[PDB]
């Protein structure tokens, strides 16, 4: 059972000091250098003067300076805005508007001029390192202190997970039978900082001691070279979004042979597809798949399970998983009731791992963060239900049940053999409305003169399973779907784009 996430690296740099605990394509740094660099970018932090607590928001990639940087945050007593060397100028102004840092940290170059805050550049940063100077902990982040703040993705809401929501996630993460986390785990980490998923790897890595490994900023852009490089990687757990795995498989590399040492893969943020699974284990017949799910609100993940070849030749939809035994789940009524196993409601987590709320937005904080039976719960703003085997499934956005959930429609028409992958949209007219943007399996277009012979026969490929109100009117076809920043298909892209 952890006790404090810092207290941990501070015992592997006692424990194992030559130990990675990070890797670039080869630079690597070690628990040691972690240790030093933290402390000392920690005294460089104290000596700024900045107000007790204030947070900071760490603009960068995902070099191991960001990581230096958080831990002398976390030593410092500090919460850290991590922001990533993607996101728009709006957003970082927007994040900082709302948030409201004392510094700026801007470990790649930072793209805009704010007065009013103080800043410094990566050379501070690295001057600090080489100062090497003494650390000792007075008034680290404990208990329900800010340990970091994450922005979602509308318009942007500050998320607070403490200390104590943070080691409920991991210390949940690395005794779960499905997760099964290896001693000194060496993990991808190619979700940004900026993006809750990361701490999926960075947190039981750094608890459990293992390595990360980071790719450079560069290799983001181009996707042949990048999953090339990947390969070369002697990484055992591969965490990301479903979708960044569907891009996996466009690549020849992508598979046992290439990657021997690959042994699991962890995934969130977005329904993992049946097809994925199914195209996972033929690529990687030896490797487990772990489908885990939860918000932001609630600490990266509130459930997980593994999935089995039983389920995907079986199932429609993959299960989200079981609950964590410290965030009691309910599935609720509109009416706030909750129902009993089965019936089909807005999921509702409890505990220590929920966020105390929206950093500075208490309006927003009141509408989805309340008192359930006492204890402090989050609308997750999600449908499902739960199974007598207390099994969480997920049938989808609230904002998209638009009676059926627009998921379901998507999820039927992924099992046409002809499909790759489906998007039930409605459209609008007064804020009144069934359409679907399709991407068809490769030499399918080419098979078919024109668009309504191919839809009819898509629409027969699946018509034995999908009820006929299920079933939407017009199909668009397009040659891939539009990705976030986050590595999610772009719903709300696709739904603006039909107005």
């Known amino acids: 059972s952890l006790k404090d996430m810092i207290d941990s690296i501070e015992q592997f740099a006692q424990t194992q000091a030559d130990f990675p605990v990070y890797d670039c394509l080869g630079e690597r740094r070690t628990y040691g250098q972690l240790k030093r660099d933290s402390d000392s970018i920690a005294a460089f932090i104290d000596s700024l003067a900045l107000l007790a607590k204030s947070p900071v928001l760490v603009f960068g990639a995902q070099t191991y300076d960001m990581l230096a940087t958080f831990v002398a945050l976390t030593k410092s007593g500090h919460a850290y805005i991590p922001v990533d060397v993607h996101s728009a100028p709006e957003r970082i102004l927007a994040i900082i508007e709302i948030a409201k840092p004392s510094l700026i940290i801007a470990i790649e170059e930072f793209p805009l001029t704010i007065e009013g805050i103080s800043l410094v550049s990566l050379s501070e940063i690295e001057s600090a390192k080489l100062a090497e100077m003494p650390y000792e902990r007075t008034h680290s982040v404990k208990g329900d202190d800010n340990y970091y703040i994450i922005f979602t993705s509308g318009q942007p809401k500050g998320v607070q997970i403490s200390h104590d929501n943070l080691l409920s996630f991991t210390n949940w993460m690395i005794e779960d039978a499905a997760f099964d986390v290896p001693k000194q785990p060496q993990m991808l980490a190619q979700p940004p900082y900026s993006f809750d998923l990361s701490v999926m790897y960075w947190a039981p890595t750094l608890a459990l001691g293992g390595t990360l490994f980071a790719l450079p900023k560069e290799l983001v852009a181009d996707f042949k070279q990048l999953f090339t490089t990947i390969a070369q990687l002697p990484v055992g757990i591969w965490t990301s979004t479903p979708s960044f795995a569907d891009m996996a498989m466009l690549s020849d590399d992508f598979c046992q042979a290439k990657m021997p040492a690959l042994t699991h893969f962890y995934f969130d943020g977005e329904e993992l597809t049946v097809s994925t699974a199914r195209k996972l284990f033929e690529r990687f017949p030896s490797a487990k798949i772990i489908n885990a799910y939860g918000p932001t609100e609630a600490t990266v993940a509130l459930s997980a399970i593994e999935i089995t070849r039983e389920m995907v030749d079986n199932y429609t939809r993959l299960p989200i998983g079981y609950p964590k035994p410290d965030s009691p789940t309910y599935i609720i009524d509109e009416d706030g009731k909750e129902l009993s196993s089965g019936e089909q409601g807005e999921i509702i987590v409890t505990?220590?791992?929920?966020?105390?709320?929206?950093?500075?937005?208490?309006?927003?904080?009141?509408?989805?963060?309340?008192?359930?039976?006492?204890?402090?719960?989050?609308?997750?703003?999600?449908?499902?239900?739960?199974?007598?085997?207390?099994?969480?499934?997920?049938?989808?956005?609230?904002?998209?049940?638009?009676?059926?959930?627009?998921?379901?429609?998507?999820?039927?028409?992924?099992?046409?053999?002809?499909?790759?992958?489906?998007?039930?949209?409605?459209?609008?007219?007064k804020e009144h409305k069934l359409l679907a943007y399709i991407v068809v399996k490769d030499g399918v277009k080419e098979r078919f003169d024109r668009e309504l012979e191919l839809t009819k026969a898509i629409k027969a490929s699946v018509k034995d399973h999908m009820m006929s109100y299920m079933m939407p009117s017009k199909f668009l076809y397009r040659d891939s779907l539009p990705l976030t920043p986050n590595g999610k298909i772009d719903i709300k892209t696709l739904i603006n784009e039909v107005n």
Request: glycine residues 8%; proline residues 6%; without cysteine.
């Open 351 to 429: 505990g220590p791992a929920v966020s105390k709320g929206y950093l500075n937005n208490p309006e927003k904080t009141a509408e989805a963060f309340f008192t359930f039976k006492g204890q402090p719960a989050y609308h997750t703003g999600d449908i499902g239900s739960l199974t007598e085997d207390n099994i969480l499934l997920y049938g989808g956005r609230l904002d998209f049940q638009i009676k059926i959930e627009l998921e379901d429609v998507s999820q039927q028409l992924n099992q046409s053999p002809m499909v790759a992958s489906a998007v039930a949209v409605p459209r609008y007219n």
